[PDB]
Amino acid sequence: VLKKNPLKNKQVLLRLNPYAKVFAAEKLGSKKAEKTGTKPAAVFTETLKHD
Amino acid sequence: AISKNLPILKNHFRKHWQERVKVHFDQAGKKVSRRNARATRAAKIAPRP
């Protein structure tokens, strides 16, 4: 009889997606990225700066 | 005016036809008069048929 909105109404969100529970549990949207260290090349920095 | 596919009519009503209309309102009255005339003729010429 009435259209209830997910992205509010956590009940209807849990009804429509069971994965949202463990998404909220393991936080999944603030995901820390592993640090890499690859450096850009001298040709790239030189053509970006001057030519 | 001829239009809109239809048969050709031949209604003959171009004279003063409304002065010559004859409506037979007296069908029942003339039937009663004919039976009275038959009965009185029978009673006059009795016993002949």
Binding site: - | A1, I2, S3, N5, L6, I8
Partner: protein, 148 residues
């Protein structure tokens, strides 16, 4: 019934359904069949071809009683026998006790030959008959007799 017409429904609107630009007139292209060769030519040629001209010869003082010939087909022949005797003729008939049908007394001029008859001999009295009709009666086992 005047209460079921559209003149009751047009009460209040001005032109009574006849249009405001046209202005409903007396006789818009003439009276009767006026202009059937001039300005009604397309309607006369489309819907009534053959209208103008003469064809054939005349007949002064034609009497329709000389042309009286109602036709009866062969498949409707056994309806000129009444229903109570029709089944006993359809079962118990030979070439010795065959029924007679006077079609002139029933009101028919010519016997035509459409359809099929059972294999029962009958005697048919008629004024006129066709070739195929007479052949079918003689093949079923009967005879056509001519009367005046």
């Amino acid at each position: 019934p005047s209460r079921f017409t559209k003149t009751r429904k047009h009460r209040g609107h001005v032109s009574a359904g006849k249009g405001r630009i046209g202005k409903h007139r007396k006789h818009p292209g003439g009276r009767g069949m006026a202009g059937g060769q001039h300005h009604h030519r397309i309607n006369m040629d489309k819907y009534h071809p053959g209208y103008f001209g003469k064809v054939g010869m005349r007949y002064f003082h034609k009497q329709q009683a000389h042309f009286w010939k109602p036709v009866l087909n062969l498949d409707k022949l056994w309806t000129l026998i009444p229903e109570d005797k029709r089944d006993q003729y359809l079962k118990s008939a030979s070439k010795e006790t065959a029924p007679v049908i006077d079609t002139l007394a029933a009101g028919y001029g010519k016997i035509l030959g459409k359809g099929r008859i059972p294999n029962v001999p009958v005697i048919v009295k008629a004024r006129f008959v066709s070739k195929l009709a007479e052949e079918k009666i003689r093949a079923a086992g009967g005879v056509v007799e001519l009367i005046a």
